[PDB]
Ligand binder design. Structure first.
Ligand code: HEM
Length: 154
């Protein structure tokens, strides 16, 4: 759905994410919670984590962020051919954690913010646009799968 060059921009900056997945995952979750604190209500085990320091010191939080970014990394590496990887995640999101699509918009914003804050030399305008399209496609395809399951995502 993207150009091949756009996918290389997405996977180039993703290679920089992979140099430190746990750190990126902490930054991305903490950014999400800062910008949209209503998202923290979905994480029953992280409600007692009151400061950014406490969140960064939580191996639980750190593990969740690695799982979530590993899943996204696997999907991004498919270059759009991700229906097999996306269905189980849609099933989990839709019928277990109950994540509205807007929350995936929020965490997509967090991802764009953290990656540009850490790798501006690897994440200019063209690369942000590529990743934005990639995350858009992830979100749209997952929302289709939500409907398929009988949840509309809001
Ligand atoms: C790029 C977007 C996201 C990806 C790829 C992702 C992926 C994952 C994966 C793979 C898991 C563990 C497996 C599973 O539960 O099926 C997980 C767990 C979870 N996700 Fe995410 N997720 C994303 C965004 C979000 C958002 C925005 C929220 C809520 C605001 C959320 C809430 C949760 C919760 C509560 C869990 C359970 C954590 C635990 O193990 O205790 N996720 N996510």
């Amino acid at each position: 759905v993207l150009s091949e060059g756009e996918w290389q921009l997405v996977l180039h900056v993703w290679a920089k994410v992979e140099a430190d997945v746990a750190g990126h995952g902490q930054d991305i979750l903490i950014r999400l919670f800062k910008s949209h604190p209503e998202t923290l209500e979905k994480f029953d085990r992280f409600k007692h984590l009151k400061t950014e320091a406490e969140m960064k010191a939580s191996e639980d939080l750190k593990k969740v962020g690695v799982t979530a970014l590993t899943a996204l990394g696997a999907i991004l590496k498919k270059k759009g051919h991700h229906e097999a990887e996306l269905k189980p995640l849609a099933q989990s999101x839709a019928t277990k954690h109950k994540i509205p699509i807007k929350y995936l918009e929020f965490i997509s914003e967090a991802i764009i913010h953290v990656l540009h804050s850490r790798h501006p030399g690897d994440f200019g305008a063209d690369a942000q646009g590529a990743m934005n399209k990639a995350l858009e496609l992830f979100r749209k395809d997952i929302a289709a799968k939500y409907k398929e399951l009988g949840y509309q995502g809001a």
